[PDB]
Design a protein around this ligand. Structure first.
Ligand SMILES: Oc1cccc(-c2nnc(S)o2)c1
Ligand SMILES: Oc1cccc(-c2nnc(S)o2)c1
Lengths: 115, 115, 115, 115
């Protein structure tokens, strides 16, 4: 599992469950092509997006569908989605966890890059 | 001044000065088109992006060019940029401040929305 | 105005108004003694806490009364308060803004420190 | 394990390793008495602070020694420590994870309360 996404809810103090997440890779013509996707588990985690073989160096966009999450809880949100855009590069045996902490009008995102 | 962006540096505890910021508005054809751009001042603020006339209802994306910012300080950061996507003026005209707090592997963003 | 506190509400996307804030300074005997207090304004800011004369070198604690804030909005939050502890003016006099962004189970705090 | 602490470093994008953490419980005379302590692991986690039997309802303070962490990396920090103060209350079968995301001039803390 070289790329994992973890989302927390800062209003309810809990994992953010069932948040849709879409990942794109930037293509040579500069458009974003679908790469992988899923919904966060009861733990607020999404595992199994990709494999070491298919996660080559390149520029990726991870879109976390925050707006639908807040709307399924009855809470008016600000953002359409949270977006995390980064270049993945080999520089040894790396695992990438993209963490996001959500509030209706605010989010933070951090990358934890290990091994 | 219906749209303002403010950026702070979480490493230095200071405003993030001279940060490039590009705003796009989603077009009829589902495309991001250029809306406005500028650079943060010595206070870390960017004023004068638009006017209440121009700033109609729409889906906007504010792209904050964080990787260029960190690179110019000798830091190789995780993200290419911070992107903030939101529907604006859909409940009538409002005033929007988009704040971002930056660290090399992390950022947060909040919107303060007032009448 | 060498010490200012600013508080935003991450649920509403607005300044956090009427938030009580108590500042203490560590005494000779290792005790926290009262230094200054106030409430945030309609802008979410608290000005006029101290003067450059009074605001000497020292270890300060800024206690932001977040639980009272959330309770008055009908939210039962996690934290009793947000506490921000720091050494001040130890490199000579500076200007300190202590910002906090609040959610019911989460907060962030940053200091912006200028000459 | 009803109380767990997890700390991330937002400048290096990694767990914050070997951060000292002290937990206090508020006593009837209103002073903080030592309750539990440890240092975060290679995963940035601290497990085994307490047991269900000894973690009764009450007010607790978790102090994360951020200043020493930044000083062992060569980075001038703002805060003396990060403090998380909260009331623990039974309301079913609860586990408390206190998460903190550190930058030199800024931190966030969230509580994830599960089961
Ligand atoms: O900790 C934060 C998070 C978001 C915005 C701010 C902030 N904005 N202006 C000031 S001053 O501080 C501080
Ligand atoms: O206080 C925060 C803010 C953003 C992310 C987190 C976090 N906690 N665990 C992970 S993984 O990420 C904690």
């Amino acid at each position: 599992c070289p790329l994992m996404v973890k989302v927390l809810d800062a209003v309810r103090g809990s994992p953010a469950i069932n948040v849709a997440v879409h990942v794109f890779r930037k293509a040579a013509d500069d458009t974003w092509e679908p790469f992988a996707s899923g919904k966060t588990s009861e733990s607020g985690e999404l595992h199994g997006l990709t494999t070491e073989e298919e996660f080559v160096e390149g520029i990726y966009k991870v879109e976390i569908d925050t707006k639908s999450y807040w709307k399924a809880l009855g809470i008016s949100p600000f953002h359409e989605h949270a977006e995390v855009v980064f270049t993945a590069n080999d520089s040894g045996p790396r695992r990438y966890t993209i963490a996001a902490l959500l509030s209706p009008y605010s989010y933070s995102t951090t990358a934890v890059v290990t091994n």
